[PDB]
Design a binder for this molecule. Sequence first.
Ligand SMILES: C=C(F)CO[C@H]1CO[C@@H]2OC[C@H](OC(=O)N[C@@H](Cc3ccccc3)[C@H](O)CN(CC(C)C)S(=O)(=O)c3ccc4nc(NC)oc4c3)[C@@H]21
Ligand SMILES: [Cl-]
Ligand SMILES: [Cl-]
Ligand SMILES: [Cl-]
Lengths: 99, 99
Amino acid sequence: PQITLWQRPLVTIKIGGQLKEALLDTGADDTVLEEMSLPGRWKPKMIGGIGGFIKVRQYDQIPIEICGHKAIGTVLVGPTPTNVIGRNLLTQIGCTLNF
Amino acid sequence: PQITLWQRPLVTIKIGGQLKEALLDTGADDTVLEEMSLPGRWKPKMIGGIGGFIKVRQYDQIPIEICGHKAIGTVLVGPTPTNVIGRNLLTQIGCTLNF
Ligand SMILES: C=C(F)CO[C@H]1CO[C@@H]2OC[C@H](OC(=O)N[C@@H](Cc3ccccc3)[C@H](O)CN(CC(C)C)S(=O)(=O)c3ccc4nc(NC)oc4c3)[C@@H]21
Ligand SMILES: [Cl-]
Ligand SMILES: [Cl-]
Ligand SMILES: [Cl-]
């Protein structure tokens, strides 16, 4: 698809058996989702943005689907005010900026 | 151009006659730059990010070039960790997301 930027670029994702809404976010290195359960090992991480840092759990090798597009990658889980899909997953679905 | 997302989408901008580096950020509604001087009067704004909120100065109708493309619009100035070009100016330069 071609996604306009007149509005926030929100998409549905499928992850850990759940459907969630998330922002396609080229300014995010990492994918960060609100509190949820995921299987497997994790390690603590601090990530920083406008306003400072939050503590998250880092889960690696998590399957996700975005717009019919399957990918796998790291998902950070913690008290983000909004779900964001970061570059680590955007690359895997072939997402580019164009102008 | 077409910009992939394997690295941060950093570009050169020009504002007030000076070159700066900034991140093309589809997850940002607005454009926020690190401390700098701009002409005219400003208005207050709070903007919220991963770690909470910051106060910024809002300047309107400011000329800014982004990767050589001319825009004129609102620029926020404050203690952001990095210069970000948000959707307010991404739309002026005709930027879309594509996959
Ligand atoms: C190295 C650090 F300290 C932090 O790294 C950031 C960048 O990569 C990491 O991935 C997740 C997180 O990414 C972001 O928070 N990205 C943000 C941009 C950013 C990049 C570097 C440093 C600070 C902010 C993000 O793309 C835009 N942000 C909103 C997202 C979280 C919904 S933002 O910076 O808080 C922002 C920017 C402009 C805005 N304009 C408005 N208008 C109401 O709200 C805004 C919010 C980590
Ligand atoms: Cl990853
Ligand atoms: Cl590619
Ligand atoms: Cl504007």
